[PDB]
Design a protein around this nucleic acid. Structure first.
Length: 180
DNA sequence: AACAGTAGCACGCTGTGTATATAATAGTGTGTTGTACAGCACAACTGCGC
């Protein structure tokens, strides 16, 4: 082994606590998009940490694109400050990470059909529909996308340890189904 | 007759469908409920006439 998964995307939610006028928000923000007809939220962005926020009239906000939990909270506080600077009585509350995505490379090809047959109740593999095997782990409850190349995607985690836990649990199985 | 330029065709590369999680919230679609409108031979009935 020796491989440890790399975090790729962190999704979080934040309650600003006050109602927002989206045209005002979009108008005053330096990096905003807002087309009511397409989606009901201002799509705001900041350069550091590089992230994207979906800002709603209710004052709720979704922050995505961060590569670390630190970066997620940091960028979230920053978006909240922007809203304040524009003039609303916003508050940075209820910061919570909802989804963590990770990925790695085991460095060997995998026999997906064998794995799907062996771990049938957790696996779903339809190569004509999507080339990767969808593995639904029980403990921890994580979803893994397994590819012939040996590249692995882990998602559905609320905490970093779950990403790490799942990979540790899957590695022996990937080894059992290697090609070379 | 030869050379240069322009147009057309073919090939290669980049971008967007499929799948995973996860939050946000008002809309859109579907289903259900309510209201309104549109071959014998003999056996029995029944029908007609006295």
């Amino acid at each position: 082994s020796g491989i440890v998964p790399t975090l790729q995307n962190i999704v979080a939610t934040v309650t600003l606590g006050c109602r927002l006028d989206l045209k005002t928000v979009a108008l005053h923000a330096r990096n905003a998009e807002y087309n009511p007809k397409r989606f009901a939220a201002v799509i705001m962005r900041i350069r550091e940490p590089k992230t994207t926020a979906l800002i709603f009239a209710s004052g709720k906000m979704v922050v995505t694109g961060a590569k670390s939990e630190d970066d997620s909270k940091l960028a979230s506080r920053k978006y909240a400050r922007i809203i304040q600077k524009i003039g609303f009585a916003a508050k940075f509350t209820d910061f919570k990470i909802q989804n963590i995505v990770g990925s790695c490379d085991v460095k060997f090809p995998i026999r997906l059909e064998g794995l799907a047959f062996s771990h049938g109740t957790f696996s779903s593999y339809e190569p004509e529909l999507f080339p990767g095997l969808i593995y639904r782990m029980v403990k921890p409850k994580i979803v893994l996308l397994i590819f012939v190349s040996g590249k692995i995607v882990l998602t559905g985690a609320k905490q970093r340890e779950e990403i790490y836990q799942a990979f540790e649990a899957i590695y022996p199985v990937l080894s059992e189904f290697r090609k070379m």
